[PDB]
Design a protein around this ligand. Structure first.
Ligand SMILES: *C[C@@](C)(O)[C@](*)(O)[C@H](CCC1CCCCC1)NC(=O)[C@H](Cc1ccc(OC)cc1)NC(=O)[C@H](C)NC(=O)CN1CCOCC1
Ligand SMILES: *C[C@@](C)(O)[C@](*)(O)[C@H](CCC1CCCCC1)NC(=O)[C@H](Cc1ccc(OC)cc1)NC(=O)[C@H](C)NC(=O)CN1CCOCC1
Ligand SMILES: [Mg+2]
Ligand SMILES: [Mg+2]
Ligand SMILES: [Mg+2]
Ligand SMILES: [Mg+2]
Lengths: 222, 233, 212, 204, 196, 223, 195, 195, 196
């Protein structure tokens, strides 16, 4: 019998700062135990200061991103070059995904950018379009490895003030871009060690009021 | 939904400093039966693109006709059909990738793995893969079927990353491809000795080589191997 | 999921947990399971995350169109029936949805309608829906009377979700509380279970099964 | 249906400077229903510590089995069993049930009393030994624990630092698993003192 | 696999290809499928490699113990031991064995033992996946009482075609000649047999 | 797993990667797949990790007792025959795939053994998920009468091919060299091409960060 | 068999077990006692597959009674529960396992403490302040989490049990025909005849 | 939905329908009215798959109410039952059939006679002196075979119905939470509020 | 079934056996598997009899309508129409067709269309269940530009072996010769071909 779905592996990570946001993803693409590519970009600039990644089955991920990029293009045509806000982009992506509710896009989607107050935003989707705004999200193969770490290091979970017995929680802070990138890099280095589908390279897209900047880092190729 | 009947095995390829190389054997297998010994699986499109196809041969012949029809259609009302409006590798690929993903989405796939090798207008090397699921990817080396498991390891020793491409000449790249084809003939049960190889160079253009044979084969060590353990004669 | 809604002397209490799961993976601890349809209408959400979000957001659009056309607030009965008739069209296709449509209108008074994805639509005073419903029912049914103070009713709804958050593996995160009156709904806060549990334990003297 | 995830729970172990740490959650459930919040998964036979995750009836059965075996070992050998030897005994005992296995994820932790060397090990259900320098993870949130350990861990941590690292690894992994949590215990093990600490965690 | 045994004037010759496959991967391209159960009693193996090796090892043991007690066993006797193992364990075995041997009394003899565990004495025998493609060729070209050179050519040409059409067959063509003179091993490489 | 073995002038060499996997996560980054059977007989293992480990230990134990009984150096064919007969008996249920190599009074030998009990003789072999990557290298570069220096290079290269190109395989390269008239040299961590890079940050916590409910001393001593 | 509950208070253990026996279509009996006295201060309630339940209970009863005669001594509740657990743990890897879940409520005369053990058909033992098997716990544990205190009297334990039974009678689909209640304390085992 | 009964006496038809609504584990409601008034002298009770029951009943109700306005006339019970049967008989060969069983109790004002029709989800119609759907009839038909007479009063019909409900409460495994009873006679439809 | 088409100097010859089976029962022992889609374009049918007949009837219709409008169709054109039907309905058809025809421009041509619906132009072609047994024989004995008598013998000997080994094949050997001279039908009975 023909199986329309596949698994191209990989892992992605979105973190929302105070006046910035990052969307990181490994550049490895796999099927079964074969490496297809060591550098196949998975995180895309979609215009209007929005970055997107649809990790899982790469054909469905490409299809979705392609459709969303087109949705941005037609939003400009139909509404007088109005900037598509990140909240509006998110709702649009829900409808793209739920449109195929009974033959799903087999991907975990994350978008990142800035909200209409200039604050950092990350939105996170299931395959059939349920979504929510979050400060922190990993998706894909090694999401189970990375997310607990981000709960601890981004949201300060299970961390208390020393000497308070355990009754004053570590207070929540925004992280600097330099601090976020350190946590991103360590998350992927860690995930590469223990997950066979993660490796080769790390590509980070950083979104600020000034635009979309890229950074690339080598990961272990075994 | 179907099952592939007459099939073609590995297509292998790589980038080098000035262009791309692609290769594929001339066999059409009918399961374990090595049925058709004269099947060309590299199909050129203009003088800048070669599409290498593995998998079902009936679906390959369909794709071959789509590409032939694509060239005809591009020429229509196009005074620059042999110049600035000629078909590019990237155009030919995106078309095929659209078709492959549409067909898998109707649950009636074209049962193939396709590599589009070519050189663009600006001299840039083009090399990209697509298969029956519409899955696409690019890499300095690409291979389908058994080639992915056996050819890529050998070809990646020559071009391990992007920065190794300018350092790789056409002689070194072709040598690596020809060796990889021998390894596949040793080890793939659905392969053949006879193959075709295509070089697409930004300076020298398209060189299409037919009726190549795997040569310099090591078999002599076989005479000394006796039994499966304890046998001495 | 644990969602509840119950009717009492001072209106409707609505309380939900905040956990979403993908098998045994905890997908989120900060999920919104109450949808604010209008100032007088709430929807609880349990089942498929997408199914709930999509169709209850859609329900809100259909309720807005009603008031544009009829120059009048949609009745709780009518709003619930729009959703129940929709899911009934999709019956068998595999939608997963369990919801309480809770609201006040002058003609109906405070009303709760349970609607689910196999087409059931029930009017009633008390409902608990989701994997943790049985746990919420245990606490709720024992301390339920018609005439609780708004303060006591809010606590019972909060406490009933807490009970289920504790015992049910697939319920947790935090408790979102609402109170529906003549004048509309009022949010009564997000209460993290990791702080609430210990607070309730000490003050109430309950949860003696736990090492504290 | 899957015996390794009916009851739920986790064990993690780590090495430090002249010390080891082993920790576990306290949950026992029947799938979604939480039953017990006092089900400890760490046992000790002399100075060798054994954590066991998986099907709870096998956890209890194997504890009783290794108590039996180490008691007889001690009577005959006239000394307590060491971690390296006990690891081999666990492996042997699991592999003899190769085709009808105990559905468990054991973890050995301890300090060799003669050499003073910290030692940890983990096993699959049929006895394959993983003898790690850094850390061992086991249970229904093993993926989560791998992620925490692989980022949080550094070598040669002092006992009171190592306590913080292993505790945070356990707590944050458990909070992302439906079938783990409900309390947690951490053992800090030195050559001739062992401290046991119950952790405050969210009870959902 | 492509295997055959052919009786001729001076005795018998066994022939085989050298390919072993796990699906479409060639696990061993230089396999020796001609295997010795006694000095001048050999067999060609097809089917499960594990099963045929396990059987061949047991037969070699039985004939070694036969020889200690009763002297040299006949080829018929060797075929019977193969049959007994194959037939009695037919539910648990995938083994297709050709038994060939040289006596001085009986001269060259060939016995084929297919999947069921039946025995068939024949002038020549062909077996394995690649044999299907040469039934026509072998029937037309086989003669009784051929010379050694003719029988080598007959086997070489036959297995060459079997190799050409069967993906499961390939590599070198190994042969083992069994006569009064002794035991001779022959090997033929691709560059020789492919151009026939 | 990527395991390989090949012969050279007056010996045989074995190679192996050091990765173990449980589903898609790495269970071990430094596991020893080249196993001791006798002082000059070694075994590469692949497949079910407990099975390949248990079957080599059992045959190694029985080879030791056989050697004591006969007062002879054990032979590789004995290990081969014992392994295949055991594995055949279990009909593939002991999912161990092994490359057996060694030196004995007969000479140097190299065999492979599959889980169902089939054996092969070869001059170069590879098994496991990375066998195809390794065999590609061996088919490209293997020749007769290799020197020891060339053989270690080729073996390690064949394993590396698996490490880089196969997701099943990874981490380090273990080698064992068995030469005629010499002690076998076992070279664990012969290559170390996958050391983890230094981390960006230290996640060492302030002491007291974790909330504690109780403390107690555990009595581990006797009496 | 459907509902079996257990609650351990200050000075006693209370076991409540449903009276219905249903074979498919019909309720064959409405007064069934789903319990056996193992020893004078140890009571075992049980529920599971038809036939297996009683066969297992009576088998355990016979073994504990045999022990009592041989040693002229009552085994502790802890010892009886460990014996029962091992028999179930042995059972699960048999040709045909006992599909039986049990609660063991006992008064330890040495320690002067009530003890309640919950053991499932796999041999999963836990000591608890209150326990249940099957779907009962889904309704009754949230109540007990709310209302239970360790220092409760036997009368308070019975009232808390009435609240559990009322909840089950309100929200469960099956008519389990009420419960037989038995108290295990220092004086032995007695049945509460009006509940 | 579980139990629906119907009994036709001298001068009326009595329909009794259970109040429980159970979704798997929990009893979500204990006061559910499993009936719709189709016309002033025709009542339809119903039971079957969740959602389908109410959707079908309300659909039939809307069609009969539409007929009544168009013709300014009440259809006979026989005519309403034939309409309902055809809709179910049409339904069974659909893409997704209505899994609904119904009883139609009506008073024919022309003939001055009560009439009870039993129709299953296949569209199997029968006119009966007493009827039931699902497992109810297994217990209640033997009673009605014994005690029924055609000349019974409405009070005698209700007493005979109490005897049916008592038997169901004794022998059925499910707690159906009692029955809502409705009488259909020459004066129309009324609910018996104490049963 | 055993079918083949062979090009030679003067044109092309189609050959077939005459056996049709329903399992092991021979439903028709005198079947005509050589079927006319045009004056000098014929085909050999294998697979489902219903499917190949249905296809052949549609092709004959298409070529008749081609001829009315555009004159005599090429053999390539006939093969293309067969392909189109086979390929587009591959999920619902079990048809293995060899198309053979004579033009004066192109002379003898043979196209084979296996299950998938692919097309392959070849000097000769073999198909059907009984073809497996003669790959070896046909490869060794085929030459290009044979005479008519040689090609008749080549087909007769080939199908004789196919019939001998395949139970699904048998009966008479029918042949159809396609040259400039015209269309000649040949038949060969068991008593002739069995003794070859
Ligand atoms: C957590 C609990 C106890 O199950 C609740 O019922 C919870 C409600 C969460 C929802 C409330 C409204 C706001 C958005 C969140 N449900 C889930 O978490 C839900 C459980 C579930 C899973 C699968 C399913 O299949 C039909 C039904 C219900 N989880 C999800 O929907 C998760 C986030 N996503 C998936 O499981 C992936 N989908 C892919 C395609 O098929 C549907 C499942
Ligand atoms: C990982 C790789 C590349 O496949 C190697 O084959 C590796 C060899 C390790 C071994 C070599 C000899 C010395 C001892 C170590 N194998 C594994 O890591 C193995 C892979 C595997 C998993 C499952 C399987 O099922 C048929 C076959 C092969 N991993 C394991 O055995 C792990 C540690 N355990 C499990 O996966 C759980 N078992 C459950 C019971 O069935 C067997 C698997
Ligand atoms: Mg790798
Ligand atoms: Mg948890
Ligand atoms: Mg919980
Ligand atoms: Mg015949």
């Amino acid at each position: 019998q023909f199986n329309p779905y596949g698994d191209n592996g990989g892992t992605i990570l979105g973190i929302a700062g105070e006046d910035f946001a990052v969307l990181a993803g490994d550049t490895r693409n796999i099927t079964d135990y074969s490496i297809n590519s060591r550098y196949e970009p998975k995180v895309f600039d979609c215009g209007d200061n929005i970055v997107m990644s649809a990790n899982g089955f790469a054909a469905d991920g490409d299809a979705l991103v392609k459709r969303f990029k087109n949705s941005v293009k037609w939003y400009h045509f139909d509404h007088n070059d109005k900037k598509l806000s990140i909240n509006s982009a998110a709702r649009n992506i829900q409808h793209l995904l739920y449109g195929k509710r009974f033959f799903p896009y087999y991907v975990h989607t994350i978008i990142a950018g800035l909200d209409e107050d200039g604050k950092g935003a990350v939105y996170s989707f299931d395959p059939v379009g349920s979504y929510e705004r979050e400060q922190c999200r990993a998706g894909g193969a090694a999401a189970s490895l990375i997310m607990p770490f981000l709960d601890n290091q981004v949201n300060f979970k299970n961390q208390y003030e020393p000497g308070t017995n355990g009754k004053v929680k570590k207070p929540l802070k925004y992280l600097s871009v330099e601090e976020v990138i350190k946590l991103v890099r360590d998350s992927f280095t860690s995930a590469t060690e223990r997950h066979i589908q993660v490796g080769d390279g790390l590509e980070i897209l950083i979104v600020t009021k000034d635009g979309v900047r890229k950074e690339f880092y080598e990961l272990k190729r075994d | 939904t179907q099952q592939p009947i007459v099939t073609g095995t590995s297509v292998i390829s790589m980038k080098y400093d000035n262009g791309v190389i692609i290769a594929a054997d001339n066999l059409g297998s009918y399961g374990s039966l090595l049925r058709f010994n004269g099947v060309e699986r590299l199909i050129p499109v203009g003088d800048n693109t070669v599409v290498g196809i593995s998998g079902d041969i009936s679906d390959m012949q369909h794709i071959e006709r789509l590409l032939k029809d694509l060239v005809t259609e591009n020429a229509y009302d196009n005074p620059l059909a042999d110049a600035e409006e000629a078909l590019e590798p990237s155009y030919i690929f995106e078309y095929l990738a659209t078709v492959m993903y549409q067909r898998r989405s109707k649950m009636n796939p074209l049962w193939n793995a396709i590599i589009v090798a070519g050189v663009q207008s600006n001299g840039d090397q083009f090399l990209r893969y697509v298969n029956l699921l519409g899955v696409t990817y690019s890499s300095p080396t690409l291979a389908t079927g058994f080639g992915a498991h056996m050819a890529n390891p050998l070809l990646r020793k020559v071009v391990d990353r992007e920065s190794d491409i300018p350092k790789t000449t056409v002689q070194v790249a072709e040598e690596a491809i020809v060796n990889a084809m021998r390894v596949l003939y040793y080890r793939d049960a659905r392969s053949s000795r006879n193959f075709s190889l295509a070089i697409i160079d930004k300076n020298t253009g398209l060189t299409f080589k037919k009726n190549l044979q795997v040569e310099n084969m090591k078999w002599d060590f076989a005479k000394d191997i006796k039994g499966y353990g304890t046998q001495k004669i | 999921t644990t969602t509840l809604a119950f009717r009492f002397q001072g209106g409707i209490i609505v309380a939900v947990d905040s956990r979403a799961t993908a098998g045994n993976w905890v997908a989120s601890q900060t999920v919104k399971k109450v949808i604010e349809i209008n100032p007088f209408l709430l929807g609880t959400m349990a089942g498929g995350a997408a199914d709930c979000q999509f169709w209850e957001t859609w329900l809100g659009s259909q309720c807005r169109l009603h008031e544009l056309r009829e120059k009048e607030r949609i009745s709780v009965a009518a709003a619930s029936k729009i959703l129940s008739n929709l899911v009934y069209q999709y019956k068998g296709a595999g939608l997963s949805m369990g919801t309480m449509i809770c609201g006040y209108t002058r003609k109906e008074g405070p009303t709760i309608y349970y609607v689910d994805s196999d087409g059931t639509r029930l009017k009633g005073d008390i409902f608990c829906v989701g994997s943790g419903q049985t746990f919420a029912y245990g606490v709720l049914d024992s301390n339920y009377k018609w005439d609780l103070s708004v303060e006591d009713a809010l606590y019972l709804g909060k406490r009933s979700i807490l009970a289920a958050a504790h015992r049910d593996a697939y319920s947790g995160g935090s408790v979102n509380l609402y109170h529906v009156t003549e004048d509309g709904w009022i949010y009564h806060g997000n209460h993290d279970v990791g702080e609430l549990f210990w607070k309730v334990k000490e003050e109430e003297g309950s949860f003696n099964n736990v090492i504290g | 249906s899957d015996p390794s995830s009916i009851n739920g729970g986790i064990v993690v172990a780590m090495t430090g400077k002249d010390c080891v740490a082993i920790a576990c959650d306290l949950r026992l459930g029947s799938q979604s229903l939480g039953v017990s919040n006092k089900f400890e998964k760490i046992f000790h036979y002399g100075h060798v510590f054994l954590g066991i995750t998986g099907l709870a009836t096998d956890v209890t059965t194997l504890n009783e089995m290794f108590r039996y075996k180490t008691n007889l070992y001690k009577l005959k050998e006239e000394r307590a069993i060491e971690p390296e030897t006990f690891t081999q005994l666990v492996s042997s005992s699991l592999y003899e049930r190769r085709f009808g296995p105990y559905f468990v994820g054991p973890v050995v932790a301890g300090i060799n009393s003669k050499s003073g060397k910290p030692f940890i090990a983990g096993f699959d259900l049929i006895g394959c030994i993983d003898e790690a320098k850094d850390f061992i993870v086991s249970g229904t949130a093993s993926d989560q624990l791998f992620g925490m350990c692989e980022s949080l861990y550094e070598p040669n941590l002092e006992p009171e630092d190592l306590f913080e690292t292993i505790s945070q690894a356990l707590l944050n992994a458990a909070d992302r698993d439906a079938l783990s949590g409900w309390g947690a215990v951490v053992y800090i093990i030195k050559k001739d003192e062992v401290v046991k600490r119950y952790l405050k965690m969210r009870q959902d | 696999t492509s295997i055959m045994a052919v009786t001729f004037k001076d005795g018998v010759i066994l022939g085989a290809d050298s390919r072993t496959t796990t699906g479409a991967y060639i696990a061993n391209r230089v396999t020796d499928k001609l295997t010795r159960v006694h000095d001048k009693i050999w067999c060609c193996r097809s089917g499960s490699a594990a099963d045929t090796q396990a059987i061949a090892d047991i037969v070699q043991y039985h004939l070694e113990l036969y020889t200690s007690q009763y002297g040299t066993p006949s080829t018929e006797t060797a075929a019977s031991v193969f049959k007994e193992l194959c037939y009695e364990n037919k539910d648990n075995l995938t083994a297709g064995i050709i038994v060939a041997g040289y006596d001085d009394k009986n001269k060259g003899e060939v016995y084929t033992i297919p999947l069921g565990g039946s025995v068939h004495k024949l002038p020549y025998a062909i077996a394995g996946s690649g044999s299907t493609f040469i039934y026509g060729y072998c029937d037309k070209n086989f003669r009784e009482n051929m010379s050694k050179e003719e029988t080598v050519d007959f086997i070489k040409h036959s297995l060459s075609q079997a190799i050409k059409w069967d993906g499961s067959s390939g590599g070198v063509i190994r042969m083992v000649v069994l006569t009064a003179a002794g035991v001779e091993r022959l090997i033929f490489y691709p560059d020789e047999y492919e151009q026939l | 797993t990527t395991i390989a073995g090949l012969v050279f002038q007056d010996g045989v060499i074995l190679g192996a990667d050091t990765r173990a996997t449980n589903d898609s996560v790495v269970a071990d980054k430094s596991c020893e797949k080249i196993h001791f059977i006798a002082p000059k007989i070694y075994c590469c293992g692949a497949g079910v990790a407990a099975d390949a480990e248990a079957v080599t230990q059992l045959i190694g134990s029985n080879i030791e007792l056989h050697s004591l009984y006969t007062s002879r150096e054990p032979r590789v064919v004995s290990a081969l025959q014992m392994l295949k007969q055991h594995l055949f008996k279990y009909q593939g249920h002991i999912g161990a795939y092994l490359i057996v190599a060694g030196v004995d009074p007969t000479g140097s030998h190299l065999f492979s053994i599959h889980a169902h009990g089939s054996t092969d003789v070869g001059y170069y072999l590879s098994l496991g998920s990375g066998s195809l990557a390794a065999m590609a290298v061996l088919e490209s570069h293997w020749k007769q009468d290799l020197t020891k220096e060339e053989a270690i290079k080729l073996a390690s290269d064949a394993i590396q091919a698996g490490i880089w190109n196969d997701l099943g395989s990874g981490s380090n390269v273990d080698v064992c060299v068995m030469e005629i008239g010499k002690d076998a040299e076992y070279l664990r961590n012969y290559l170390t091409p996958n050391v983890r890079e230094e981390k960006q940050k230290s996640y060492k916590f302030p002491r007291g960060t974790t909330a504690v409910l109780k403390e107690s001393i555990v009595n581990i001593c006797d009496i | 068999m459907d509902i079996i509950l257990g609650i351990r208070v200050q000075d006693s253990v209370i076991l409540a077990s449903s009276k219905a026996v249903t074979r498919g279509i019909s309720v064959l009996k409405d007064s069934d006692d789903k319990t056996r006295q193992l020893s004078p201060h140890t009571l075992m309630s049980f529920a599971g597959e038809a036939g297996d339940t009683v066969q297992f209970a009576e088998y355990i009863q016979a073994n504990i009674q045999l022990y009592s005669i041989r040693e002229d001594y009552e085994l502790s509740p802890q010892a009886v529960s460990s014996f029962v657990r091992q028999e179930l743990a042995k059972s699960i890897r048999s040709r045909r396992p006992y599909q039986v879940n049990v609660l063991i409520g006992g008064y330890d005369k040495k320690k002067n403490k009530p003890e309640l053990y919950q053991i499932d058909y796999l041999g999963t033992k836990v000591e608890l302040p209150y326990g249940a098997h099957g779907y009962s716990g889904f309704y009754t544990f949230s109540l007990l989490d709310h209302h239970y205190r360790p220092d409760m009297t036997t009368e308070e334990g019975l009232d808390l049990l009435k609240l559990c039974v009322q909840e089950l009678e309100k929200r469960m689909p099956m008519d389990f025909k009420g419960v037989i209640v038995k108290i295990v304390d220092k004086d032995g085992i007695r049945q509460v005849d009006d509940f």
